Every structure is written in structure tokens, then in C-alpha cells.
Paper text:
AMP acts as an activator of R15Pi and in its absence the enzymatic activity has been found to decline dramatically. Monomer of PH0208 protein consists of an N-terminal α-helical domain (residues 1–122) and a C-terminal α-β-α sandwich domain (residues 123–324).
To verify the preferred molecule at the ‘AMP binding site’, PH0208-WT, PH0208-C135S and PH0208-D204N were crystallized in the presence of both AMP and GMP. During crystallization, even a higher concentration of GMP (4.5 mM) as compared to AMP (1.5 mM) could not aid GMP to occupy the ‘AMP binding site’. This further indicates a higher affinity of AMP at the ‘AMP binding site’. Evidently, when both AMP and GMP were made available, AMP binds to the ‘AMP binding site’ with a higher preference than GMP, while GMP occupies the ‘GMP binding loop’ only. Binding of GMP to the ‘GMP binding loop’ involves very few interactions which predominantly includes only the guanosine base ring of the GMP molecule. Thus, it might also be possible that the binding of GMP to the ‘GMP binding loop’ is an outcome of crystallization artifact. Both, AMP and GMP bind to PH0208 protein even after the mutation of the catalytic residues (PH0208-C135S and PH0208-D204N) at the active site pocket.
Numbering used by the authors:
A (entry chain A), B (entry chain B), C (entry chain C), D (entry chain C), E (entry chain A), F (entry chain B): 3 to 324
């Protein structure tokens, strides 16, 4: 019940997308549980255990679609839970939580560097790469390919409604990479000059489907139409455990004013509904490879990544639940 | 040549897209020649003929892609040239121009009505319709189907960068028609609930391809993927004669500042290029029917429309050439 | 208002499908018009005119999907009407109706044997041909090719619910053509051994789509999948003039007792709805050729059959109307 | 050689399809093995062993296509065999056979209700689901989802020739699920209004293909065409171990009298062959997921189900062999 | 019966492909009938008529697949036949034949220049064009595009068995055009760098299929897979009249030694058959446009080219027949 | 290092393709290391280790694409390196090399046999099989299916530029198997009569793509178009480990003079470039099954083969690196 302010501020900052990107919100959430355990004034283990459960619930209940976030929380709290239930005293608990969270953060950072190097071998000198939204994993691949001296150009899609495309373009251009910026609508038109597509992921399902930023399934579709390789750069913690047992992933519907600003929308008629899905779902048939920190897989090998990292936990409850 | 200010002003408003839409700019160019003819101070028929040629060229060099405009100019000018060359006197030439421009304007208005009556028959009670940009021809269909008492909803795509979807959404709402407004990236995600696609055209080619607002081809692609009928509402003067003899249609590239506003765009590094094609091309295999004022055709019958109405002219030079 | 029993008997027999097959029902309506004229006790030209308009409406309100039937009634009534409006006396009108029926009925027979001759040229020695329902035009093709000494075998799908495939199997076998009889569900399984598919049509639209017995579109889809030629054998009076101006064809829904017999259906619970559609719609992209009495066309040239033989009549009302 | 009548009665009832459905026949063969052990008048361990090998062969030679049946006989006989070869006395062997049957039979029941639970998670409120034949695993899915309070409707294809769709329709309606009953030919026509397809399996191969009731592959093809999820609900004992080493599955050809009744068939000429295939084969590319009792897989992970649970046994001979 | 040697020598030279290419053999055949009429020693018209029939039969019976050849013969002999049957005297016949043949030859030459100019507008600066075999029509397009200053490169396929690819490569390279020469097998591999495909035709059917050099259908297929425009450059006399009435085009099977030289094949075992089809058939769905001397058409407009140039003659016998 | 002439001679014969075929060159490289080890005059184990490393590199730098060769070298050298580093004396090192090379050679021969026994089960009585190049693995399948008494015919493609089809045709004929020999361009034209496609592989990637003789991808493309099973017969040592970590396979570009002989080629102008890729890449969606010595897999299960047998090594440098 004695939740420190950094937990609430991180939760809010995930909700408002001031902190965004599936990897980042997962690291931020691990960091929040880390600080809760740093600054906790609890005396008993039972007390700190209970603070960490509640912090974890607050953080889970921010944004639903990227399983990166629950997987972060799980990574920390499977360990914290095993400690507490094994009889660890206060400081043995405090450290288990803090250290588990530090592990996840470090492993996330290393995973992304690694995805960069693996994916870059798939990029060739002269390539024109089209990307969508702003994905650290995808940018790692493109950045690495450029540092290897491959002379590349990236077609960056603006990525409505929230313009993540702007971030992507200034970022790649600041590393020296030539950028071509277009609207989402122009993806087919420019698919004819594109050699490779590199996008990220928020959740990957057991059958190989990729839930990523709205628009992704379209770029994928047309890439298939033209035989351009769709490469999804994604850490293993993007893979979605509960899809193993039949769960559909929730698609986050965000506020209509991200599309039509409040000052404008209030003046619009009542029979207009504005629908603002945050993600769509791309089928495995439109994906060439998924580049994980453990290597290149075909998208249908997602079930293998999950069988072996994740499946064990599905017979238990979540490690923050009563 | 002494060109009236209405010609210059029309030309600027077409360039700037204050006046926009394929059919409307064609009416605005007819109108402009009408007014050059009305307000002319010419004494000799050669002097007026010269004014009409120069005005025609000013209007021609506004926007390239939509062939409606050239076709409107031709409709007036073939007739003006036949009179002048057949020895018409000043007033008979003036009236030929005025009256030809009027006929085109009236024919365009009636054709749009007829297109609506025709396309509406293919809309069924309960249909969810997806559209793109703001096409008067497409809208005529939706408007008439609603007026027949069919309960429809229209999914309207915002149509970046110039946001024509806003015009379409407000217009359909004003007639009583519920709208679902979405970003362009969401067209595949909502194709699964869509019963019909209805878009316009700027130019249609001899092989049946449809040049229309940027992103049209994406929507038609995923429509096909999903077996949703793609219906293109379009006047005969949208069909492109020069394509009969192999001409490719120029795709208008518009200012970067429509995509990114000038204030923001001047802050960006020089190795980001903003590219803003205003149209793409949708191949005939992704189009179910074209709905013209003379009936439903498959897209490959575009050559028939071109043969029977515009082929005759391709042996002659352009009717405004001096 | 004095309508002869034969008109009523034909109508009732078209409704119960005792008279069936798109061509046959058309000939039966023409026959009925002919007999209404032959047996008329009408003493005035206006009195006969009124009997024929009324017989036409009775006949038109039997089965809606096959345009063959109304195109037959048209052929006659356009001619009856031009006579009546030109001032024709009684026996001139009676004869115009008698000799218009005769003409259509004889032209139907000639068209069907000519489709035989043309279609048989696309059947090759050794061919295995799959068909569906019982189409006289399809059968003419197959029977002619067997008479050219080509060793063929026909796969006859049983064609639920009304078992028309039994008629086809006994018919083709009676000519000495070996038949393979299968359930409809088995059409994909046998498509691998099939060389050609030959089916009939109830109506063909302006854009090339073919409305024919329920199932036809599935057989056509898997035929496309396997690159087996789908050939549609159809008289020019199967082409649907109203589709030129956007009309959709109504799909006859027939009695659920044709699917589940009345004795058994009455015992079933109300929360099972039985839906019996008599036709489906096959898109033009899955049709290699339509074989008409005037030649082979790609399905997209359906609009030409229509433009050249039927379009004239769409500016007038139906010839049996007040 | 002293085989108890129940074994003979089960075999005859699997042959006539009085006992049918891949799971049920498997449980029935296990039940029969169990009763052969219970009622055996055998005084030696070698005498019982020999009765069970012989009962197994009788049961295996009933219907070939569904691997479920031999995987059941295996489950038991592998265990009977290891006992017998380990030196087991009589009542130890009798019990090993009794308790292996029991185990398989109970595990079949648990597997089928677990597929219910997992599969139901992919059904969404409002869904219209098409199915085919009568599959207990498919039905468990649909029934569980209805018990979660999701308003669904099921389209039941009648499933010629043996009319299994009648069993499915009455079953689902008995649980209060509204049903739409249609002929098989109508599956493309209704695919446009279908949200999900759920079908069972008789055998699933190493590369993902699904052998199931004749028709299944057509429904799957048009489902793919329309981007409707095709979900296969199947116990792990439907997976076919011999396909790992290249074996193809035999397609049972059943009596032509199931298609044309004997009373009518005898009147037909000899040059009509009636071919009644009980199953077809659906390729993996047209299957979105297999739902097993252990999870959701892409169809290409069938080889893992097999590698991990069955492959061990392929270096030995069949457990009922000499 | 008094056939001059140039007729026999041309026939033989067509048979051996010393004269080849569909246009060329058509011109050569017209030329042969021209010389027969130059050097004829006939006295009566009836005598010369009879020489021209027999010359025509000799020339027709050379190579079967390119309808260019019969259409040449027809063009000359429809005119010669009308003259003779109208009562023309010897010299009026002699000139009719000679002049008709001179017309065809000139019109063929002009048609090809014209196809060149039309097709070249479809070629863009920088384009890499893949072609197949050696087609004058296709080369006209590429040559013209290069003379317009478009900087192009052509991928020339070797075109087994007869190596026409060598001719094509030396020809284009002698005009200054950069050539990349590859084997037929590499067409897919290099389809990714190709912007346009330009091939010729031997016969074009009523439904839009293109019979062209063996291999054409493959290049077309993969071009569709990659969305590369397939442009077929072809004169109207390549279009095939009798396909209007159901005729399949014969595919010429040429001597096995063109594949395996005689010195080698004689040593090969008896159970090896060498099959050497000269042409395959490409479906209309894989063709973007057909470029005729009358302009760009979609391939399904082939029936229109035939309806209007050719259909009239199909109610008559050939103009060389008794 | 004193390298025996057998190493140098093997290396030259691999380069020149005197010894060719993916599997054979791998055996020839094992063999060559065997012989370096047998005939070595080394006194110290370090001196032999050095010889084995240098020989390994000479053999590695022969031909790049087929990963069988590197894998054979690795099989021997991992084991040689473990011995040398574990302190083996001269003779124990010599024998480790000799014996490792022998095991690889024996395993390769047995694997090819097993592949035949496995693939043959998927060949049915009456099958027409199309193959490409000369693959011992594919041939083992065809040979065994014939020996099982299945009546097969094989369509053999000539496989330019090096004409490996000649080897395949003579070899299959010599076993009794009828052959149809065709040029590569005719593969689509004969796909319509083909029941099965059976080819080999040089390298198979982590995502399931198959690098095989130039034109393989074309044949698989049209096979897919036609629903003909594409089966790839291939040993586990054809699977490519470095692709697990993103490596793309180099495609061997061979001398222009294989395509055009040197005598002819020196006469050609310098602006013709002959390009001779020896392989292409066939994507996994066009492959039905890969038949390895351990069973049938779908192509996407290539990652499983790579994980379970070769992944372990990718953390270590190459076992011949100094
Ligand atoms: N050089 C290469 N090395 C490894 N994999 C490749 C290479 N080139 C293409 N691929 C893969 O093989 C397939 C070829 O696809 P496409 O580029 O459509 O021909 C894709 O699945 C790629 O991931
Ligand atoms: O983890 P990284 O690769 O950085 O981004 C992965 C994905 O998460 C983001 O979602 P949002 O912007 O938070 O909704 C984008 O959809 C992006 O592709
Ligand atoms: O003639 P209507 O149907 O109104 O418009 C047709 C098309 O012209 C417009 O172009 P723009 O907005 O002027 O660039 C849009 O592309 C629209 O679909
Ligand atoms: O195991 P469950 O899911 O009940 O049924 C599986 C399958 O078995 C049935 O076969 P048949 O009626 O025995 O020929 C049907 O093909 C059904 O899909
Ligand atoms: O008329 P042009 O365009 O020159 O050639 C047309 C076609 O005829 C040739 O046949 P062949 O070499 O005579 O069998 C080639 O197939 C070529 O594409
Ligand atoms: O191992 P096996 O099955 O014999 O051969 C496999 C493949 O290797 C060969 O390459 P090349 O002829 O050496 O360039 C061919 O591509 C062939 O299909
Ligand atoms: K591209
Ligand atoms: K390309
Ligand atoms: K085939």
C-alpha cells in the first residue's frame, strides 16, 4: 500500500506515451519496481512483497498490447516471489527485486545491440530500407548496417496518428543515414524502389502473427505483393506467452483526440465516430524472418521461443497475484 | 494576349488546391475560358482565338495528373478551333466558347448525378462502405444510397497529407450518414468489417488502371485480399486519351511543406528529404467496376470509352496549339 | 384479364422447377405467350395487348434469378408493343406475338447447338471434364466433343439440394460418355485429375460475373487454384441488361424443404434456420472464357454482348408495362 | 485366436460408421482391447498376449484414414508389450492392458474439453462460425464459447454423403446455440458473413496438412481467399507418426451406395462410376492454427508434436506384430 | 501447278527457320506470292488464280503456330480472290496479287516502327528491361526508347534451344544499348533488378492469351509475382481469327536434335524422349498491355481487334480453298 | 606447411567442377583431409595440426555456395581440434583426422540412401516427376520409387549452362526409368502434366529457403501456381549454420565462358556482359517438404535441424582458424 511516487509517475508516463516503444516501457517498468524496492520503508518481507505486488499491478494496468511490459514485470517478480516464498528475509528480498530488475534492463539493452548485428547481415550495400513507426530494435539493425559501411537509404513512414516517424527520421539522420520521409499512404507507391522492410514488434503470438504499430499489416501486405523481405526485429520478451493457450491479444484503442485535436473535434457532428487503434496484426505469411537476440527465425518458430522460455509459467498464476 | 484576371485567379487556386477535386477543377477551367470569352475586348476573331489559346495554356499548366482538366479545355477548344477555322466572326466565336464551356459544366453536373443513381444500386441495406479522400463522384453514390433508405455507414480515411477525409466526413454527416473516421494506416485493420469500397479517380488509362489520391492503391490491394468490391466512381472525362498511344501519366509531386509545416521543416537536417506524391496508380485487377455516367464497366473496358469518345482527336494536335 | 390456363400452368411449373434450366424456362415463357395469342377470344387489338402484358407479368414473377426468362418475354413483347403502337389491327398483333415466340424458341435451339460446336473445339482428346448442375449449353459442348471421337470422361457433381447432377449423369451416359459421379464437397479432391471445367449460366453481368447454380463459384475457385480452364457455355440471352445501369441480381432463396424433407424438418427445433440459396456468383477473374453462339469471349467482354444487343432498350420501360 | 465378441462387434460398428468420429473410434478400440482382457479365459501370459495382438489387428483393419485409431491401439499395446517382454505374469499383463485402455480413454476425454477451453478463447462475442461434418473437438470449442456468454451462430454444412451435419446441427441447437444449416456447395456464398471456421481432423501429417471429412479443403480454400481464420481442433493422437518417414495417408473410399441408394443405383448404367472419398487433404498454408490439448500451434509445428511424443516408436515395429 | 522456285525456297527456309520471327515469315510469304505473280507464265486468269492458290497452300503448310503467316496469305488472297471472282482479266489479277502483297509488306514495316514509338513511351529513363527470344516488335520499342536518350540496359535471355537470344544481344548492342546476357533459368533471379518486360508474339487469342517463344509464360509468371509490367509488342496481324470460334492454336513441336545434336542423341538410350515445343501460352492475367500499331490495349481487348479486323472472313472459306 | 598433392588436386577439381554436386564435393573434401593425415610426414602434433588447417582453408576457398563442403571440413576439424588441444600425440591426432573423415563419408553415403527410402514413399504409382540439375539426393528418391515397382517417368530439365540434365537423364535411363528431356524454358508448359517436383539443395537457411542450381526457383514458382508438390531431397549437412545469426549465402558467379564458349565470346562487343549465377534462392512458401535422413520436415523446421545439430558451434570460431 506504500507505493513510492516513481511508480505512479512511470505508470502515468506509459499511459500518456511520454515513455513509449515496447522495449522502453518494459525497462521503465522494471526500473519502477527497482525504485520501489530501493526506497521502500517496509520492515517485514511480507510488507515489501505486498508493496511489490501492488506496484506491479499499477504498472501492468497502463497499456495492454505490448506483452514486453508484463514480461518485464514477470521477470522481476518470478524471482521476488520465489525468494519470499522460500523464506528470504527483508534484505534478501530487497536485493532479489532490485537485482532481477537490473538484470532485465541490462539484458534488454544487450538484446537490442545483438539484434542489430544479426539483422545487419541481412542488409546489403545500396539497399533502400522502408521502416514504420519508431522501433529501437529496427533502428539497431539499420544503424549497424550503416556503421559497417553499407551505403543505405531509409524510407521512413510518418506513422499517424502520433507521428513516431518524425523521431525515427531525425534519429537515423543524426547517425548520418540518408532518410526519405513519406506519408503512410505512399507505402505501395514507394514499395517498387524498396529492397528491404525492417519493422519492430509489440507482441508476437504463438502462431507467428506480429502485433505492431497500426499500418504494419499494410506495409507487410504490399511488401509480399512485391517480394520485398519483411524483417521484424524483436527481443524474445516481445513474444506472448498466453497466446500458447488461445488468448487473443487486446488491441489498444486510444483517445480520438490523437487523430482530431480536441479544439476541432468538439465542433464536429455527433454521427462521426473517430476510431484510433494503436496496433494491427500482421499474419506470419507476410513475414520473412523474426530477428531475435538468439538469431533469425521463421515466424512460425515463435511457438519454439515460447515453449522454451515461457511455457513453464502458464500452469502458475502471475507472480504478483493473490 | 490580354488575359482577364479570372483566368489567372482560377489558375492560382487550382495550383494551390483552394479549388480541388478532379471534376471541380475541370468545371473551373471551362468557366474560366467562358469568362475570358465573355469579358474579351477583342475586335478580330484571331485576337480572341489567341486569348483563348493562351488562357487554355495557363490553365493547362496548373496541375498535371487529373486529365479531367485538359479534357474540359479540349471540349471547349476543339469547338472554338472548328468555328475560327471555319471563318466564324467575332461574336460567333465568342458564343461558341461561351456555350461550349456551359455544355461541359452542365454535362459534368449531370454525369455526377447519374453516376450516383447508377452506383447506388450496387449499395445494399446494411453496407459498411470505405472511401478515401474527397471525391464528389463517390460521394454522389453514398448520398443516393442513403436517400433510397439504405442504412449505411461510411468509413472515411483521413487522407494525408492534405486531410481531404475531413471534408468527406463532415459532408456525409451533414446528409445524415454515420461515419467512422480513421487514419490511412488502419485500412487493412478495418477491411474485415467493410462491405464495399467506393473511391474516385483523377485519370483512368487505356489498360484500366486508375490514378487517384495517394494511398488508393493500398486500399484496393487489401480490398482484393479480402474480396471487398472496389468500385471506382468516375466521369468519362476522367479517362485519359494520350494513354491509348502509350503515354504514362505524370504523378504530381507537391510541396514538402504540406507533409511537414514550414516552421518545423526548416529545423530538419538536409539529409532528410520529404517526398509528397499526390497520387498513386491502382492496377485494373484490383478494381471490380468503374461506374461512369453511361453505365457500369469492368476496368479493362476503359479502352472502349476511350475509343468511342476520344480516339478521334489523337491524330490532331492539341486544340489550343498556335 | 382473360388469361389462358397454359400461361398459369407454365408459371406454376417454372415455380416448382418441374420446368427448369435457364434456357428451357425462357423457351417455356415464350411458348406460353404464343399460346395466349393462339387461344385468345379477344375481339380488339387493345384487348389482346392487355392479355399479353398480364401473361408476361405472371411469367416474370416465377423465378427471378435467371435473366433468360425476362429476355425471352422482352424479345416477344418489344415486337408486340411496336406493332400495337404502330396502329396494328388484331390478327397482325396476334401474329406478331406468335412469330416472335417461334423466332426466340428457334433461335434458342440454334444458339445451343452452335455453342456445342464452338465449345467442343476447346475440348482435347483424352480430356477429363468436370461440370456442375445440369446445363444444356454445357452438355452440348461435351456431347459434340464426344461426337468428334474425342475420348473424354465427365465428372458430374451431384449438385445438392435438388440433385440435378443425377439428370446430367444419366443424360451424358445415355450418349455413351463415361461419367464419374461425386458429391459437391469432392470437387477440390478431383480437381487435380480434371483438365477442363464446363458449366452453364443463369445470368451474366456487365462486368463478367456469372450467376449459376449454388456451388459454381467454389468449383471455379479451386479450378483457378489448379490452373484448370473454367469455361462457361451461355447463350447471349443469359446476359443481364439491367446490370449495365448498376442493378444487382437477386439470388433466389427456395423452400428449406428441398434441403431437409418436410417430414424430418418439422421435428427439428426452431433455433436451426435452413437457408437454401439456388445460385451463387462467380467473379470474372476465375473464368477463362464464355462460349456464346457468336463466339468465345473473355468474361470482361460481357459488356459488349450487352452494349451491342440490349443497351438500346434501357432508355425505355419494360415492354409489358402500363 | 479366442477373441471375444465385443472386439468383433466394435470392429463391425467402426466399419459401418455406426461408431464414427476420429476420437470416438479410437476410444472404442481401446474399450474393446480392455474387454478382451477382462473377459479372457486365458491361463498363460503368452496366450493373452496373442489374443491382444490379434484383436489389435482386427481393430486396425476397420477404417484406415484416421490415425487416432492406431495411436490408441499403440498406447495400449506398447505397454502390454513392455510388460510381456519384461517377464510379466498373467494378471500383471491383463491389468497393464486394462489400465492402459482406461488411461487413453480418460486422456481422450480430458484432451477434448481442454481443446474446448483453449479454442473458445479465439471465438469473440458476436462471431459467426462455419463448421463441417461433426467433430467433437470442433464442437467443444463452440459449446465452451457459448457457455462463456458469447453470442455466436454456427453455420453447419450438411456434409454429404452421410449427412453428419444433421448430427452437428441438432447437437449445437440442443445447447441453445442458434444454427444456420446449408448445403456444402453454399460455403463460398456464406464465407463473406463468416468470422471463423472451426473443423476437426482425422489425421495430421508431419508437414501440417490435415486429413478430414471430404469438403474440408474447399471450405479451407475459400476461407483463405476471404481471410477468415481456419482453426483445426485436434487431440495430439490425431497426429500421424508414419508421415515423419514419408508415409502418405490412405484416403478411405467407401461404398457408392452411401451416395446413390442401392434401390436407385442398380437402375443406372454401368458407364457411370460413383466415387465416394471419405476425406480430403488440406494444405498447411490454408490453416491458421491447430488447437491441441497442449496449446495452439501453427500447422507447421505439427512435426514437434510428432518429434516429441511419437518419433521414439518409429525405430521399432508395431507393438501388435510378430 | 507451275510454281516458281522462290515459292519452294521460301517455304523450305521457313521450315528450317533460316527465315524466322513471326513478322518476317509473314512478309516473306507475301513476297513469295508476289514473285509467283511476277514470274508467272499463265495466260488465263483461271490459270494464275490456280497457281496462287497452290503457292499459298505450300506456304501455309510450313509452320503452324504463328498466325502472322496465314494472315499475310489471307490479306493478299482475299483481294486476289475478289478480283478473279469479279471477272478481272489476267493483268488485273497479276497486279492485284502483286500489289496486295506489296501493301502487306509495307504495312508490316510501318506497324513495327509505330509499335516502337508507342511502346517506348512506356519505357522510362534508367529502366532495366528484360526481354526473351528475338522479336522485331520488342526490339523496335527498346531501340526507340534508347534513341529518345533514355539510359536503359536490356537483360537478354539466351532462349534455348535455338539461341535467338544471341541475335537479340548482338543487335541491341550494335545500336549502342547495354546488354546483360543470361540463361533462361536466371529469369527469376534477375527479376528483382528488372523494371519492365518487353516480349513479342506469334499468335494472340480471342481471350487475350499470348502464344510466344517457349519460356515466355515463365518470365511472365515471375514478372507478375514481382509486379513487373509485362508488355507484349505485337502487330494486329499476330491476332488469331479462328480462336473467335473456339479453335485452340497448335504448338509446333520441332525436331529433337535442336536440343541434343544428332551426333550426341544417337548414342543416348531409347527410354529418353526429347520434347521440343517451340512456343508456350501465357495467360492474359500475366500481361499488362499489348502494344499494337493502333495503340495500347489491355490483353482482354484482343477480341475487339479481331471483331473489327477479322471476324467478317470467318463465315467464308479461306481465300486459297476449292 | 607441406601440403600433399591430393589436397591441391581436389581443390582444383572442385573449382573446375570436374567433381561437383553438393554432397560429393563434401565427401571429396573429407577424403582430402584424410589423405593429408595419412601421407603426412609431420613429427610433432603441432606440425600436422598446421597442415590440416592450411589444407582445410585451401579446400574451403574452392566454391562458396554449397555449405555441405564447410560442414564436412568442420565435422573433421572440430574433432581434430579437440584432440590437438586435449594433448593428443602425433598418431592419435592423425587417427582422429582419418577416422573423422571416414565417418563423414560413411554418414553421407548412408544419409543419401535413407533420403531415398523416405522420399520414395511420397512417390505414387503412375507419377510424372520433374527434376532439375543432377542431385544424387533427388535421384536416390526416384531410383528407389522405381525399384519399389512404381511406374514413373521423369521430366528432366537440361539445366544450362553446364548441362547437368544430361547426366541425370542418362543415369535415370540406365536404371530403367523413362525420361522426358526438355529445355529449362519449358517447365511451365510441362507443369500441367507433372505430379511431383523433386530437386536437391546446396544450402538451406534458417528460415527454410533453399539455395539450389540456377532455375530451381522458377520451377518451384510454377509448381506452386499449379499445386504440384515441391519436395527437396537434402542431407542435414546441407543446412547452413551461419544463417542462424543472419548471414546471407553468397551466390557463386561462374565464368562467362560456360554460357558462351571462349571462341565465340571474344568476338562479342564489350557492352554485352554475360552473367552466370550458378544458384538461385527459392523461398520456403514454395517448398512442400524437405526430405532429410532424419525424416520429412516442413521447410520452416530447418531452424530445428540447425538448432539441434549446428547451433552449438557458432559461439566458437572456425575449427581450422590459426
Ligand atoms: N543470399 C541469401 N542467403 C540466405 N537467404 C536468402 C538469400 N537471398 C534470399 N534469401 C531468403 O530466401 C527467400 C527468397 O525470397 P525472394 O527474395 O522472394 O526470392 C527469402 O525467404 C529470403 O529470406
Ligand atoms: O521496442 P521497440 O523496438 O523500440 O518498439 C517496438 C514497437 O512498439 C512501439 O509501440 P508504441 O509507440 O509504444 O505504441 C511501436 O509499435 C514499435 O514498433
Ligand atoms: O472528381 P471527384 O470525384 O470529386 O475527385 C476525384 C479525385 O480528385 C481528387 O484529387 P485532388 O484532391 O484534386 O488532388 C482526389 O484524388 C479524388 O479522389
Ligand atoms: O475426433 P472428432 O473431433 O469427433 O472428429 C474428427 C473427424 O472424424 C470424422 O470422421 P468420420 O465421420 O469418422 O469419417 C470427421 O472427419 C471429423 O472431422
Ligand atoms: O514478329 P517478331 O516480333 O519479330 O517475333 C515474334 C515472335 O516470333 C518468334 O518465333 P520464331 O523465332 O520464328 O519461332 C519469336 O517467338 C518472337 O517472339
Ligand atoms: O548433393 P546432390 O543432391 O548430389 O546435389 C545438390 C545440388 O548441388 C549441385 O550443385 P553443382 O552442380 O555442384 O553446382 C546442384 O545444384 C544440385 O541440385
Ligand atoms: K522492390
Ligand atoms: K523489380
Ligand atoms: K499437374
Amino acid at each position: 500500500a506504500m507505493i513510492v511516487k516513481e511508480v505512479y509517475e512511470t505508470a502515468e508516463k506509459i499511459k500518456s506515451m511520454e515513455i513509449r516503444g515496447a522495449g522502453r516501457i518494459a525497462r521503465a517498468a522494471a526500473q519502477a519496481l527497482m525504485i520501489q524496492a530501493e526506497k521502500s520503508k517496509a520492515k517485514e518481507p511480507e510488507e515489501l512483497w505486498n508493496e511489490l505486488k501492488v506496484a506491479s499491478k499499477i504498472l501492468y494496468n497502463t497499456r495492454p498490447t505490448a506483452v514486453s511490459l508484463p514480461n518485464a514485470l514477470r521477470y522481476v517478480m518470478h524471482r521476488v516471489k520465489a525468494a519470499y516464498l522460500g523464506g528470504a528475509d527483508l534484505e534478501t528480498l530487497r536485493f532479489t527485486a532490485i537485482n532481477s530488475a537490473k538484470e532485465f534492463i541490462y539484458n534488454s539493452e544487450k538484446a537490442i545491440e545483438r539484434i542489430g548485428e544479426i539483422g545487419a547481415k541481412r542488409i546489403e550495400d545500396g539497399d533502400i530500407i522502408m521502416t514504420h513507426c519508431h522501433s529501437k530494435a529496427a533502428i539497431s539493425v539499420m544503424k549497424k548496417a550503416f556503421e559497417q559501411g553499407k551505403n543505405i537509404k531509409v524510407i521512413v513512414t510518418e506513422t499517424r496518428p502520433k507521428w513516431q516517424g518524425k523521431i525515427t527520421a531525425k534519429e537515423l539522420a543524426s547517425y548520418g543515414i540518408p532518410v526519405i520521409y513519406i506519408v503512410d499512404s505512399a507505402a505501395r507507391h514507394y514499395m517498387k524502389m524498396t529492397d528491404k522492410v525492417v519493422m519492430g514488434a509489440n507482441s508476437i503470438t504463438a502462431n507467428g502473427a506480429v502485433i505492431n504499430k497500426i499500418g504494419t499489416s499494410l506495409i507487410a501486405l504490399t511488401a509480399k505483393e512485391h517480394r520485398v523481405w519483411v524483417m521484424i526485429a524483436a527481443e524474445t520478451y516481445k513474444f506472448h506467452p498466453a497466446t500458447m493457450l488461445g488468448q487473443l491479444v487486446e488491441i489498444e484503442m486510444r483517445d480520438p483526440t490523437e487523430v482530431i485535436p480536441e479544439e476541432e473535434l468538439r465542433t464536429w457532428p455527433k454521427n462521426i465516430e473517430v476510431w484510433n487503434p494503436a496496433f494491427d496484426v500482421t499474419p506470419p505469411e507476410y513475414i520473412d524472418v523474426i530477428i531475435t537476440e538468439r538469431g533469425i527465425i521463421p515466424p512460425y518458430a515463435a511457438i519454439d521461443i515460447l515453449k522454451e522460455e515461457f511455457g513453464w509459467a502458464l500452469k502458475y498464476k502471475e507472480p504478483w497475484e493473490d
